[PDB]
Tab-separated table of C-alpha atoms and ligand atoms in Angstrom:
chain	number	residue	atom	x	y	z
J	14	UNK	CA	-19.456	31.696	70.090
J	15	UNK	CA	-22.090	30.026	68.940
J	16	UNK	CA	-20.516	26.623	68.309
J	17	UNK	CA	-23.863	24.798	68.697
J	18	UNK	CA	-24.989	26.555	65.303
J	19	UNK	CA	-26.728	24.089	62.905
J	20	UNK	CA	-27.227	25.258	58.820
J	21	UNK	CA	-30.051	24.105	56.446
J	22	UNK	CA	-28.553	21.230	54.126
J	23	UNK	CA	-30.646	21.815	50.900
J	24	UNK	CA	-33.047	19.004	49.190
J	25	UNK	CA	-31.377	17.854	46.319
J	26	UNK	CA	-29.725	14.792	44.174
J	27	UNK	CA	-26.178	13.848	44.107
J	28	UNK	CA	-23.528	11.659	43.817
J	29	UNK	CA	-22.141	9.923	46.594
J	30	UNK	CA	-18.701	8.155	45.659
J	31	UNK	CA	-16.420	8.171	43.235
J	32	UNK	CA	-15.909	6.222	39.805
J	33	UNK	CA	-12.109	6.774	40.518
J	34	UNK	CA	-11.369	5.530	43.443
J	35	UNK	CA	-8.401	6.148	45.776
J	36	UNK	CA	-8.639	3.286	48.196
J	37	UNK	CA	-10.248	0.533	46.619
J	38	UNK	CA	-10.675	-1.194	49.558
J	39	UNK	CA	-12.930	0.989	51.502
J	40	UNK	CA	-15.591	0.659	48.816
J	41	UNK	CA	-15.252	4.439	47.633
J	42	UNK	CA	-16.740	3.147	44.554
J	43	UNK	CA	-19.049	2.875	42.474
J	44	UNK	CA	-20.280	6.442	42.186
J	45	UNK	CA	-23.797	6.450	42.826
J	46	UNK	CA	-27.112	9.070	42.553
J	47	UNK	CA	-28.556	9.752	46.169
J	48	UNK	CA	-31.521	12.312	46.787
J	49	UNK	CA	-31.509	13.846	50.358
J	50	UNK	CA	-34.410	15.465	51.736
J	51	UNK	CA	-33.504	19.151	53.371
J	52	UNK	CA	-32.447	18.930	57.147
J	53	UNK	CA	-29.851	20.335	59.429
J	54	UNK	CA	-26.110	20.084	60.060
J	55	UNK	CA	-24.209	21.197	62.574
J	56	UNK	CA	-21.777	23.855	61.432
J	57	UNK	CA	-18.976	22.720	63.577
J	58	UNK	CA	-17.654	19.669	64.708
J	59	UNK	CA	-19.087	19.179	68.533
J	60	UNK	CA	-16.386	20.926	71.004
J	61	UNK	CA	-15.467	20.006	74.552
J	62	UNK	CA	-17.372	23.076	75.602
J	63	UNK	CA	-20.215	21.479	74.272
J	64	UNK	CA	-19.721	18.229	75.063
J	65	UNK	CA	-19.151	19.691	79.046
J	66	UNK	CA	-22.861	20.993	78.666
J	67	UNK	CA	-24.198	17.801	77.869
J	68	UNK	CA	-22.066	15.913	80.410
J	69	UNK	CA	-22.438	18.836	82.937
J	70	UNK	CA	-26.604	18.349	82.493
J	71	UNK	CA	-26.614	14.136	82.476
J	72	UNK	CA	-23.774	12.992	84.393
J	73	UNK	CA	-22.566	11.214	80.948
J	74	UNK	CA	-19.431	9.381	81.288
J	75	UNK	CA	-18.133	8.404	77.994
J	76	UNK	CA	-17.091	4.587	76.959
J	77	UNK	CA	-13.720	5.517	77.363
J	78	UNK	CA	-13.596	6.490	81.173
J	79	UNK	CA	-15.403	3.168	82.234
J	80	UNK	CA	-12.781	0.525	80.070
J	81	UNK	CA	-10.084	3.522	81.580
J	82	UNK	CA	-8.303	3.782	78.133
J	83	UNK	CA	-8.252	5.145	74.900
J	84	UNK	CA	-6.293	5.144	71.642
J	85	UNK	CA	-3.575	8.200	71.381
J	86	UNK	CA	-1.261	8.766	68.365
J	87	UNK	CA	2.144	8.601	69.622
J	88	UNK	CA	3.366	11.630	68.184
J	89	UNK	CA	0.988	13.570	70.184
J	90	UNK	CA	2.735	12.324	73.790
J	91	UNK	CA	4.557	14.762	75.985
J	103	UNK	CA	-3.480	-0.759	68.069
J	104	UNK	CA	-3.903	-0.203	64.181
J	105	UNK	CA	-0.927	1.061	63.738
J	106	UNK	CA	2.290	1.226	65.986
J	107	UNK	CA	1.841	4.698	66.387
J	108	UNK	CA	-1.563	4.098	68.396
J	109	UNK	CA	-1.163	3.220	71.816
J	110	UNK	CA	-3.358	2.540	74.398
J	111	UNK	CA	-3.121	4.995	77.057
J	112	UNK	CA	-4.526	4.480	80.711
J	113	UNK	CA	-6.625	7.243	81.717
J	114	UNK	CA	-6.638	9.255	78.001
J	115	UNK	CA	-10.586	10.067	77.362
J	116	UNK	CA	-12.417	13.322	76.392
J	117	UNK	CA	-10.965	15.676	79.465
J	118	UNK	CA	-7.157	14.252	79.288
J	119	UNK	CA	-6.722	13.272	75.269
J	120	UNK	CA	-2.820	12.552	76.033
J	121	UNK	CA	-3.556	10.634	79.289
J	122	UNK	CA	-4.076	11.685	82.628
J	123	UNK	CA	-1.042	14.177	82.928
J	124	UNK	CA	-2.758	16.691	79.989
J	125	UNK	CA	-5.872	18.836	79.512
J	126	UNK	CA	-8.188	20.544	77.629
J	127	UNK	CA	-8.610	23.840	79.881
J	128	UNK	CA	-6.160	25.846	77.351
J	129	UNK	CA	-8.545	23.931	74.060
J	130	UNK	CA	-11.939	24.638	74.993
J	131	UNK	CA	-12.846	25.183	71.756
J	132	UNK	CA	-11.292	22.110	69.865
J	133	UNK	CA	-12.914	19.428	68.753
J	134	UNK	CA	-14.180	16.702	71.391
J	135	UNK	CA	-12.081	13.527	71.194
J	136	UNK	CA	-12.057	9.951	72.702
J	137	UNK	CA	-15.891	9.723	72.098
J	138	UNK	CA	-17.152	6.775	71.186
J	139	UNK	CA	-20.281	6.159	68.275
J	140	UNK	CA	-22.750	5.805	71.448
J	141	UNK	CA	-20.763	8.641	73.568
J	142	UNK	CA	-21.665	10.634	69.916
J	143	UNK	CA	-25.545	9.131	69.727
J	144	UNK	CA	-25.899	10.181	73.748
J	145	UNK	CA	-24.651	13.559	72.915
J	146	UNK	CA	-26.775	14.259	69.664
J	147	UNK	CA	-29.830	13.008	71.250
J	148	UNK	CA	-29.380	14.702	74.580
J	149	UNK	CA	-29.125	18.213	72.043
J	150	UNK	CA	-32.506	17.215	70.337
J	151	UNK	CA	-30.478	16.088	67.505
J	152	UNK	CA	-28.823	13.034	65.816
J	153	UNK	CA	-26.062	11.503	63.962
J	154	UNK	CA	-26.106	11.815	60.420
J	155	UNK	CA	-26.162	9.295	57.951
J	156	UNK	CA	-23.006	8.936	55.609
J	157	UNK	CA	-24.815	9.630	52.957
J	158	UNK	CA	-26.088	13.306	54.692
J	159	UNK	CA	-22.656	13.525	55.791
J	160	UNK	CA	-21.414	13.235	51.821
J	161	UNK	CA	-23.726	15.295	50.845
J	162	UNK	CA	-23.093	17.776	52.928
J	163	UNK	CA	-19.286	17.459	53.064
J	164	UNK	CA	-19.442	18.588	49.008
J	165	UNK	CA	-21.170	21.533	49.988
J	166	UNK	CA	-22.862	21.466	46.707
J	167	UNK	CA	-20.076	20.843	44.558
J	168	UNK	CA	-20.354	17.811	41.828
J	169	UNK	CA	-17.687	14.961	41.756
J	170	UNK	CA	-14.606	17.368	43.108
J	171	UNK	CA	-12.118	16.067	45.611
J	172	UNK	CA	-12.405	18.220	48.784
J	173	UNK	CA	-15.652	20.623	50.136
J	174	UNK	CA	-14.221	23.077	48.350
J	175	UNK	CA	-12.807	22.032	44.718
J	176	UNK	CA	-10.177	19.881	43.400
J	177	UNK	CA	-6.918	21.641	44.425
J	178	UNK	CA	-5.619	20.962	47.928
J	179	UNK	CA	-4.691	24.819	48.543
J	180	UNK	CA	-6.548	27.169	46.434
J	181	UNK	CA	-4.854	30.232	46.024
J	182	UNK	CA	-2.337	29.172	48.270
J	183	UNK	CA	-4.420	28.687	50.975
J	184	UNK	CA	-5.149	26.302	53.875
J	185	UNK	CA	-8.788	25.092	53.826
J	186	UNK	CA	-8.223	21.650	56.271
J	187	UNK	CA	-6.295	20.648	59.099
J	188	UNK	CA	-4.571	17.859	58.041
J	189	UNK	CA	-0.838	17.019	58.297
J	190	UNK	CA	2.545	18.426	56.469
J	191	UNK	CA	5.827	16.671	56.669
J	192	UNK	CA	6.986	13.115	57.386
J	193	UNK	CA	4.299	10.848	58.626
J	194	UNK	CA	4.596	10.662	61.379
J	195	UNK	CA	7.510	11.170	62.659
J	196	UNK	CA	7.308	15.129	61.556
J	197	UNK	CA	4.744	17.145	61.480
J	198	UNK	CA	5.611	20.340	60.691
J	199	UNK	CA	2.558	22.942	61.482
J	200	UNK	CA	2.469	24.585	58.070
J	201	UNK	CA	-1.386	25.069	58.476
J	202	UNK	CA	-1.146	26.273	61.802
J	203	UNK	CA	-2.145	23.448	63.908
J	204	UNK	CA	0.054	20.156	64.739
J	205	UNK	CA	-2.737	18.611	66.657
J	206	UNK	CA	-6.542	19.828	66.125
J	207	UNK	CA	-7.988	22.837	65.365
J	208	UNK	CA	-10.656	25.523	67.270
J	209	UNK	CA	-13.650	23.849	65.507
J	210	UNK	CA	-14.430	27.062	63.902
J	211	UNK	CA	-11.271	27.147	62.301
J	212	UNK	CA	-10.370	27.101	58.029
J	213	UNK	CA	-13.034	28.703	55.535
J	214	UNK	CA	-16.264	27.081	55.476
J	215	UNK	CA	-17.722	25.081	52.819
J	216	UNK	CA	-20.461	26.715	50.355
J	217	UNK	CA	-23.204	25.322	53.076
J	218	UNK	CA	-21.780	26.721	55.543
J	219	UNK	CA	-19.458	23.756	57.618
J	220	UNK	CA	-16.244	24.155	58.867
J	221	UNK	CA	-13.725	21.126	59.277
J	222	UNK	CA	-16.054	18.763	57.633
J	223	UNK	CA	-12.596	17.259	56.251
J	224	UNK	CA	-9.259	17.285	58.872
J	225	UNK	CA	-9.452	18.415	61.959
J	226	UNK	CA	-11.400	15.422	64.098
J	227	UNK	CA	-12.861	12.454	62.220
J	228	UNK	CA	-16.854	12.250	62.271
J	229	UNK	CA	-18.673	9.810	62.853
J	230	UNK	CA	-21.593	8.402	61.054
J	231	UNK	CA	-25.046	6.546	62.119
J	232	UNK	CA	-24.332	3.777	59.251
J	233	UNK	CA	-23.108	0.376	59.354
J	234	UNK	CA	-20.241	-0.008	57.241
J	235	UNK	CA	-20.063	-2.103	53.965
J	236	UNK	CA	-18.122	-1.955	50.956
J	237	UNK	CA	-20.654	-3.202	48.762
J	238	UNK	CA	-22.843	-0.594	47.561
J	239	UNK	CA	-25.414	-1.199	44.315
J	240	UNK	CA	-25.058	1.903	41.642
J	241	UNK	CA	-29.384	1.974	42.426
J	242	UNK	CA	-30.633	5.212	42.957
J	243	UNK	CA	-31.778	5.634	46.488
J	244	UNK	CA	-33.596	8.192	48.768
J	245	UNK	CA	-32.604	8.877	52.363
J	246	UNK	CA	-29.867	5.896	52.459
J	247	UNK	CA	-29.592	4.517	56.105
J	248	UNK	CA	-26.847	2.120	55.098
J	249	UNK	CA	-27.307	-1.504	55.674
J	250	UNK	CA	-29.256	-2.693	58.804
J	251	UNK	CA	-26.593	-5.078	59.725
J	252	UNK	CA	-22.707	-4.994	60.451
J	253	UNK	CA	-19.922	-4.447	63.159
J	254	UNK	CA	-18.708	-1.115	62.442
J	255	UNK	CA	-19.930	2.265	61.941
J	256	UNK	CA	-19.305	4.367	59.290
J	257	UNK	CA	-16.834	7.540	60.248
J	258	UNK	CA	-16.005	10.024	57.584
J	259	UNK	CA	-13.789	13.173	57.090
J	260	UNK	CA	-10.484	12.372	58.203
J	261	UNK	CA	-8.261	14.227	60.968
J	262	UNK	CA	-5.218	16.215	61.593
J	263	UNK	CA	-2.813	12.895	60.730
J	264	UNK	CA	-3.957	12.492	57.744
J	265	UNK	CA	-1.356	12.734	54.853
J	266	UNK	CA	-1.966	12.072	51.031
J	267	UNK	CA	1.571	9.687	51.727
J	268	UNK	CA	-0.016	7.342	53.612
J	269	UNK	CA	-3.603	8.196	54.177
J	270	UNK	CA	-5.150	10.241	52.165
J	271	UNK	CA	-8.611	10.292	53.712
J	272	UNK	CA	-9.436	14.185	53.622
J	273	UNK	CA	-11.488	13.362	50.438
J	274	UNK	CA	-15.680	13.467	50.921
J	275	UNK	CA	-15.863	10.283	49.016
J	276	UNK	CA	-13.365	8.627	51.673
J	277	UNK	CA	-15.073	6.367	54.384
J	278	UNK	CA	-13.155	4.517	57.343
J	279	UNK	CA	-14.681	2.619	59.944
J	280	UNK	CA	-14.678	1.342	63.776
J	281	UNK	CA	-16.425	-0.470	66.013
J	282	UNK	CA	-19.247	1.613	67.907
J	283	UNK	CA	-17.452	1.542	71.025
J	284	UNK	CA	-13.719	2.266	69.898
J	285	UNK	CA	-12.516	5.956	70.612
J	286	UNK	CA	-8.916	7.596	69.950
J	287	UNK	CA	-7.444	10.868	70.111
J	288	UNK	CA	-8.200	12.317	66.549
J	289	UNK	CA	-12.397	11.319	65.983
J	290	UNK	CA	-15.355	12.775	67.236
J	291	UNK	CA	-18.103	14.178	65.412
J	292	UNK	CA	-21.014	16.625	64.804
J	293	UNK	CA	-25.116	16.222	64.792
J	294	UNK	CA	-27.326	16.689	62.185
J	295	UNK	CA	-31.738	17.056	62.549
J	296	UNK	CA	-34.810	16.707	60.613
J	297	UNK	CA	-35.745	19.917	62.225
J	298	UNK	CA	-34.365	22.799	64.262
J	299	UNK	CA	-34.188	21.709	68.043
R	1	LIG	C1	-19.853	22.541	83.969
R	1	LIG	O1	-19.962	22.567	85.386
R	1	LIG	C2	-18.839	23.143	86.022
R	1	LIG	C3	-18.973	22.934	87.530
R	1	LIG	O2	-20.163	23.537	87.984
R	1	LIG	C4	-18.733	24.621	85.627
R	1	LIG	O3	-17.588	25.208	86.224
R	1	LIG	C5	-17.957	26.146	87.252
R	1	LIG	O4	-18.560	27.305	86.712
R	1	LIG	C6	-18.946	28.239	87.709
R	1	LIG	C7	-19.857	29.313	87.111
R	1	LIG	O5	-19.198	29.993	86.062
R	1	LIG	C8	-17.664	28.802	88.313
R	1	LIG	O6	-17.928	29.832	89.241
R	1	LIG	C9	-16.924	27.666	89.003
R	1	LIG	O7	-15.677	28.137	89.463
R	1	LIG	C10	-16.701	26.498	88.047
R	1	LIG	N1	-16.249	25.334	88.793
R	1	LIG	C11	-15.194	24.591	88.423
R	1	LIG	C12	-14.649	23.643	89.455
R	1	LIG	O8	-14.664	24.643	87.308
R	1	LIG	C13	-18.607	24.744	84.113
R	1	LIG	O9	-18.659	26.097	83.699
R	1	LIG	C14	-19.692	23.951	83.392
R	1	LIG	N2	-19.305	23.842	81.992
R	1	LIG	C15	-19.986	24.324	80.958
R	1	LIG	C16	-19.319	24.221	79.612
R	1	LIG	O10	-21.104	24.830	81.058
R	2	CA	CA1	-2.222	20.455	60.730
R	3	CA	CA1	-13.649	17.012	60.941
């Protein structure tokens, strides 16, 4: 393993957002040109091997252990929604609640982190978040205007490129791509710049504030707006389902405040220059 990995994002111009929106109200729109400077991603989505180095080395404990809750999807036992509950003692090590484990999942996604649990992390590694607009970019893997990292079709060629959900939402999930909850972060084909699970798997989040309004301006290096209450995450997760969210999309932004956490966002790190 070398789940730590980071890949060079190229310079370029693109376009973040979409002229055809699929939630309105998230501000998906208007498409817009954005030049990014070359930098580094992370190839994979920060795992709780990882995240055990970095709490191993600092002592860290996450947002999450010192309220003594976090949000779990109900499905996932042994609020925005009434399938979110808060659960007593779920965090990063137990992301059911006390009673469950991630000794079998070392190599899944870490969960129940917070935007500064994901900050302390990055900058711990030598790294940082990345912006939305990196995290666009870079999502597309150098694709212009499609849906997903990799094209416009859910399953090329019949295949599985995202862990997301299949069946009833969410009373069914049926496994089809393998996984019911997440994924080994180095799971699913990689995008053309290398990422894996950039959509599905675990959420991501961003460094941004979120805001809806966005001016069709061309801009360089976009930091977001330096106000707000929210951060931006991207990506989607596992739940998602194009039924009732259909948030898999690169152009598709959600948000939370900086220290929420739940059972189906992390995130991964991104740097000017290799650490
Ligand atoms: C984080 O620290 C723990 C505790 O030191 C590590 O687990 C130990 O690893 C040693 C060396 O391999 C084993 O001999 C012990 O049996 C382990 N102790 C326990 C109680 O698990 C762990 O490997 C470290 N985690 C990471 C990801 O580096
Ligand atoms: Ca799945
Ligand atoms: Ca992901």
């Amino acid at each position: 393993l070398a789940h730590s990995k980071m890949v060079p994002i190229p310079a370029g111009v693109f376009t973040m957002g979409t002229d055809d929106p699929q939630i309105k109200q998230d501000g998906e729109a208007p498409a817009r040109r954005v030049t990014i400077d070359a930098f580094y991603m992370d190839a994979y989505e920060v795992s709780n091997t990882e995240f055990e180095k970095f709490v191993n080395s600092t002592g860290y404990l996450t947002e999450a252990e010192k309220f003594g809750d976090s949000f779990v999807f109900e499905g996932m036992l042994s609020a925005a929604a009434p399938w979110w509950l808060p659960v007593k003692g779920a965090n990063w090590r137990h992301p059911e609640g006390p009673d469950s484990t991630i000794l079998h999942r070392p190599d899944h996604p870490v969960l129940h982190v917070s935007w500064n649990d994901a900050v302390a992390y990055c900058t711990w590694a030598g790294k940082r978040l990345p912006t939305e607009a990196e995290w666009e970019y870079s999502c597309r893997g150098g694709l212009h205007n499609r849906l997903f990292p990799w094209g416009n079709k859910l399953q090329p060629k019949g295949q599985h490129y995202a862990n997301i959900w299949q069946g009833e939402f969410p009373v069914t999930n049926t496994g089809e791509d393998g996984f019911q909850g997440t994924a080994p972060v180095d799971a699913f084909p990689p995008n053309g710049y290398g990422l894996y699970n950039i959509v599905g798997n675990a959420w991501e989040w961003t460094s941004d504030w979120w805001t809806v309004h966005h001016s069709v301006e061309e801009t360089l290096n976009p930091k977001g707006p330096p106000s707000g209450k929210d951060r931006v995450k991207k990506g989607g997760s596992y739940m998602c389902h194009r039924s009732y969210c259909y948030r898999y999309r690169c152009a598709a932004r959600s948000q939370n405040t900086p220290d929420s956490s739940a059972s189906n966002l992390g995130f991964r790190c991104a740097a000017d220059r290799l650490p």
